[PDB]
Amino acid sequence: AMGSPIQVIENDRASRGGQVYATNTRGQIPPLVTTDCMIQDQGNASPRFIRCTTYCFPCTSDMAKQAQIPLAAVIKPFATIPSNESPLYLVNHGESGPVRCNRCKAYMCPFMQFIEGGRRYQCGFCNCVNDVPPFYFQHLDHIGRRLDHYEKPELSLGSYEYVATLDYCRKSKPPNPPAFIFMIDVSYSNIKNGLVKLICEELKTMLEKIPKEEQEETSAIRVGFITYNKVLHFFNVKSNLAQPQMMVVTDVGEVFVPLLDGFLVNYQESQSVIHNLLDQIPDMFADSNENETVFAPVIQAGMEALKAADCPGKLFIFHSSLPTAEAPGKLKNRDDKKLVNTDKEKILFQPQTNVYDSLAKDCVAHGCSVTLFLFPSQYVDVASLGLVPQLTGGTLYKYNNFQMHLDRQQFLNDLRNDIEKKIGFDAIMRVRTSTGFRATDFFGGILMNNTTDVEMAAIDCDKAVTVEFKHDDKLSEDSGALIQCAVLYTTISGQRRLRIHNLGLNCSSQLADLYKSCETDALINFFAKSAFKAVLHQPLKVIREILVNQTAHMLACYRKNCASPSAASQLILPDSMKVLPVYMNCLLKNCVLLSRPEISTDERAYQRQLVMTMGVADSQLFFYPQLLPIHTLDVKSTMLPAAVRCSESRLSEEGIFLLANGLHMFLWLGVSSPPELIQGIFNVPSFAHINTDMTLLPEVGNPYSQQLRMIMGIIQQKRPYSMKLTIVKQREQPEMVFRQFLVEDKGGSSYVDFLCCVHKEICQLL
């Protein structure tokens, strides 16, 4: 009888929700990602920005090897700070630039001990001593606290922003504001399913919402336009035109941009000329009979346009099907089963040609990021298409078997979202640590050429990078472990900027403190991205064994070193890892690590990329969904209903439920569902009068339909992807797809199966 995930989440919500979490302590343990609470920085970076697997590091290397607890931080460096919480301040250190340690190269942060009348400060990271520059000097108090400790935010807060001087810029020159380039697949597939008109028609409205700062009246982002169907149709939309021009490029082997002016123009200047273009493109290709398309040249061109304008940018590719036309990046249909017990399965999750890596390297080297709206109806090789959007830090939206009457609203909401996303460009992240340990591995939509600088072409508020540390030398239980995540980047107004995140952590030689300071939602986050990245290199039966044996090796070490003596018939778990067996068992049930029967390689590749970009708030939900009972729902007096364990055992033939994991949202209906509810929600008399194939939003019932619409809205709030609703009648229905989300069931081995599996190898260690 183990504490359920629900019992733990609601427990922490009771004792910590509705309370101020003030990050004023070194090894302080923040609440769960599942606990809505207010946060005051007070010297340490918010857990919305960065969370850790353990907030108290083992002090030596051998001690960490004992527990085998992975030391990692999940950095969401531009995460959406709630409206009621204190925002970041921007610090300008003059022509000199931000004050940094001469040896550590760490930026001025509250971890800098000022000494010697304030003339010199000792670095908190490498204990080096620096000369306080004259313009930045101040006296120190009895304590030493600078007089402006609470006045200058870089000395009191954990999160803030720096102004970057010209030596932080490409070519040492002020960069240019970025540009959005919209590129539409116009093959017969996207013509027929009415996709083209929609993007174009819908696009006119959307451009207005292009991001801009409060300090500027008109968005500094310029806009470019392209269509394609194995041939590239560029477009000239200069302001001084009555009619837009078209320039068609046919040399797909050696692509180029036929323009410089009239391509990437200010929308508010070229408004009438752009609307004139979007009105036409539907009619222009309405009678196109072309099916073959190209892909890699489209990224190749939008990247080239951005280099020609000497500016960063973001590509908005809208694609339909598998690119087959003879060109670079020509993808074949290569779905062949060599996944289990083959030692070569890693091929399926890798791109076919070698160019997509080189193409991705070129985009990052020039600050070009690719975001892709894919509309498949057949095999597409997500492993190949999504590789450039991932490495460039962009997002990927897949809409399996798009139909306008259904998935229109889902796609438009994803598209409005990605435009208005708060974006930074041409970014490079660097994670400096104190003495004794260093960042040795990185996970996310990133690219890395050396072993320290994490290059992100674009980065939004939803991206999150997972960073692994290893032991360099022995730490000190007095000073502990420090972390400083810095992200140099260019803004949507063209300014060079540094966002700084500082986090202090405790150190101890006692294993008890190491286990007492663990977070499961973050430990699950690391193990997933670690395993998902290992999919490319090692067999899945190897990866699952490593995850299992590292889990048992963590729990046995706790059994044989911390626990007060207990009987041999007991599995003893720490409070920080109450639910770690449940979640870990769900990761081993996920299709990325599971078997061929009934799941496309595309679906395995899509999820393998989705998780790689997630923060802890999102990685938690995707692996343990939220199951809400709707029949028992209070009416008109509603907060979010209490959650219910993910299992078929918790469903009722008389009930209605709402399962969501961040990407799909299922409405489940039992055979004996009360017809009173089915009428007040679906406007049909009985259960047998519903159609599963009609999964569009209903609206009429005032009493409940509004209550059901309300809880769906608050579930969707923090969620970056807008979820595909799927309605399930109970028996003999598309329930098979639904049942895979009930993660505590068998389906691999169930929850109580994996618990008992952990306890056999926890005693095999003996």
């Binding site: 009619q243 078209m246 320039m247 490029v249």
Partner: protein
């Protein structure tokens, strides 16, 4: 008279032979210094002739296959005719049945030795004018060029197909009639393309299109596009030349027609405003530090682009000829455009080559409109896709041709072993020709001899036609009638035919041995047909049928056509292109310019091209074909003093008299010449005085004859 025989045969048959009486043996023919050869103008102006509305009757022998002509014997009783070339007996078509000695068909009447038939191919095809426009030029030159292009557009027939390609850093093939949006296909101006590749990339079927569309349908759309065209947008750094991809745009221009309308009449009119800098066809580097090739540069092996660039246009020219299309080059720029590299395109096809300072000059705009001169019926004076076949009597064999032609390498009994110029064939292909188009056919010997010239061309208005010219000249026994042979000598025609040969040797690997060979023949001609006692130079005299020939050689060996080192490589190419294209009359004007004198004492009379004719009280009018100069004798003071005064009515007319004739020539001549008004001591007087072992140096005409006199007598 023999001077009337020449004038009446040039006028009737468009032919002019070096000899009108031929030697009856190969041996004595060799010793005659000038070979049996003729300047043939296939489409000579002849408004007296009707266009006959039926198919020409042909000789039934496959190897002969000549056309019925007045020299063919006719037996009206048996309804048969004997071909005068192979002696085959030939039956008549049943539609001729009523033929009689007094009501004979037209092709048999000697008045119709030259005649034109109207064929019935069955497909009437429209003309195709493909514009290829350079956009690396100041807004002045481009705006004027747009007006010249809108003007040419108005003159084309309604059914004609027009097409627009523009180029600069890129190359754009525009889609016409695409309304509501302007679209074009773009290609890197640095990579070559084949016609098959371009057919695929543009998405075209094999063998009106989206790119070539009728004038009447797209007149409004093309003129709107033409008026909206602006200069190459890509900037030009300091000390650098614009990136101009002329070699690529033409390779795309030729290919665009090669895969859409092959084997039909079409003009690829390429207007360039500067040298191609982005290869292939690369004429010179992109940096202004280096200058364009000079004759001394290319001589010192110091023009690193010439051999590469020429071979591109060379292969490009043969493609267009083999397809059957014309390549014009309208090249106006303040410096060279690479005409030397591109000369093969208007030289092997029948294209024009127009040079100029800028497209915004009265010179260019006028010259361009003369291209589209219409005949008396509103049809262009152009013909397309011409096959020139020549049959000879069994005693004569064709050497080859010189001029706007491409060999079809069709062997036969009339082909000689030793060939000359474009030889080894009895058929040539002339893609674009005009009434003036004039070739030079060369013959070889081994009771009259006869030669037939058959030309099948596509007249404008899509009417397929065949032009037939049958000539005969007398056989003579050179051991008994040299006098009868020397009386038929055409000194004028023999002069051009030799210059035609001597300049063809100048393009080949042969060097200044041309002058050496040119004089070796001149000396041979004096020794054979000269009156003299041996070793008495003063005794030597000329027959009046020959006296002018040495003076022609004098002005030829010192002309621009063979002394290039005072001109630019593009200028020398411009001159030679026109000379091997002209009839006898204009060809003579090129070699020996015509000098007229005007004075108060007598009407205007032609004078000697020597400094003696330059007199203080004389106004001179010089006429080399390419420029018209007016020289005021030291009259210059009467002009500078303003003698407008009503008393000197006559002096106002003397100044006006040569100008009035100059304006006449400034509308008639197709390559409208440069005009020069200068006087005694003027800066531009240089253009007159200059125009005024090896045989001799740049020595006067009198010393030239003296050295020639003493050599012919020893």
């Amino acid at each position: 008279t023999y001077l009337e025989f020449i004038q009446q045969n040039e006028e009737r048959d468009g032919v002019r032979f070096s000899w009108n009486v031929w030697p009856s043996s190969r041996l004595e023919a060799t010793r005659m210094v000038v070979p049996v050869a003729a300047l043939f103008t296939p489409l000579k102006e002849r408004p007296d002739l009707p266009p006959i509305q039926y198919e020409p009757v042909l000789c039934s022998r496959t190897t002969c296959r000549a056309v019925l002509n007045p020299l063919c014997q006719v037996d009206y009783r048996a309804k048969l005719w004997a071909c005068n070339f192979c002696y085959q007996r030939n039956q008549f078509p049943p539609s001729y049945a009523g033929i009689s000695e007094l009501n004979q068909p037209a092709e048999l009447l000697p008045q119709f030795s030259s005649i034109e038939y109207v064929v019935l191919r069955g497909p009437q095809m429209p003309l195709i004018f493909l514009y290829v426009v350079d956009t690396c030029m100041e807004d002045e030159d481009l705006q004027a060029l747009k007006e010249s292009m809108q003007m040419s557009l108005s003159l084309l027939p309604p059914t004609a197909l027009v097409g627009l390609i523009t180029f600069g850093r890129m190359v754009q093939v525009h889609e016409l009639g695409c309304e509501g949006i302007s679209k074009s296909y773009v290609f890197r101006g640095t990579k070559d393309l084949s016609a098959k590749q371009l057919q695929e990339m543009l998405g075209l079927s094999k063998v009106s299109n989206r790119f070539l569309q009728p004038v009447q349908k797209i007149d409004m759309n093309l003129t709107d596009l033409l008026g909206e065209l602006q200069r190459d947008p890509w900037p030009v750094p300091q000390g650098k030349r614009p990136l101009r991809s002329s070699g690529v745009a033409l390779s795309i221009a030729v290919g665009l027609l090669e895969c859409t309308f092959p084997n039909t009449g079409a003009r690829i009119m390429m207007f360039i405003g500067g040298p191609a800098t982005q290869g292939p066809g690369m004429v010179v580097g992109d940096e202004l530090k280096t200058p364009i090739r000079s004759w001394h540069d290319i001589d010192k092996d110091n023009a690193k682009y010439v051999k590469k660039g020429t071979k591109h246009f060379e292969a490009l020219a043969n493609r267009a000829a083999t397809t059957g299309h014309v390549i014009d080059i309208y090249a106006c720029a303040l410096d060279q455009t690479g005409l030397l590299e591109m000369k093969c395109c208007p030289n092997l096809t029948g294209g024009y080559m127009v040079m100029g300072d800028s497209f915004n000059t009265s010179l260019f705009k006028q010259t361009f409109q003369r291209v589209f001169t219409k005949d008396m019926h509103g049809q262009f004076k152009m013909g397309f896709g011409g096959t020139l076949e020549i049959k000879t009597s069994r005693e004569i064999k064709i050497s080859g041709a010189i001029g706007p032609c491409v060999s079809l390498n069709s062997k036969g009994p009339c082909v000689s072993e030793n060939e000359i110029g474009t030889g080894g064939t009895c058929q040539w292909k002339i893609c674009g020709l005009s009434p003036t188009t004039t070739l030079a056919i060369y013959f070889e010997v081994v009771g009259r001899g006869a030669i037939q010239f058959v030309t099948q061309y596509q007249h404008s208005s899509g009417q397929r036609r065949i032009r037939v010219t049958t000539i005969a000249r007398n056989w003579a026994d050179a051991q008994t009638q040299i006098q009868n042979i020397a009386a038929s000598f055409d000194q004028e025609a023999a002069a051009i035919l030799m210059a035609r040969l001597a300049i063809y040797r100048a393009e080949t690997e042969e060097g200044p041995d041309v002058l050496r060979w040119l004089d070796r023949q001149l000396i041979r001609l004096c020794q054979k047909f000269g009156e003299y006692h041996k070793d008495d130079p003063s005794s030597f005299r000329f027959s009046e049928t020959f006296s002018l020939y040495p003076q022609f050689m004098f002005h030829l060996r010192r002309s621009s056509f063979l002394q290039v080192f005072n001109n630019s490589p593009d200028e020398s190419s411009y001159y030679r292109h026109h000379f091997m294209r002209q009839d006898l009359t204009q060809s003579l004007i090129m070699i020996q310019p015509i000098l007229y004198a005007y004075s108060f004492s007598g009407p205007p009379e032609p004078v000697l091209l020597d400094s003696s004719s330059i007199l203080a009280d004389r106004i001179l009018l010089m006429d080399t074909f390419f420029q018209i100069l007016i020289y005021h004798g030291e009259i210059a003071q009467w002009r500078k003093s303003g003698y407008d005064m009503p008393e000197y009515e006559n002096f106002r007319h003397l100044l006006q008299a040569p100008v009035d004739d100059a304006q006449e020539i400034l509308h008639s001549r197709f390559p409208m010449p440069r005009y020069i008004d200068t006087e005694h001591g003027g800066s531009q007087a240089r253009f007159l005085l200059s125009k005024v072992p090896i045989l001799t140096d740049d020595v006067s005409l009198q010393v030239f004859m003296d050295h020639l006199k003493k050599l012919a007598v020893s």
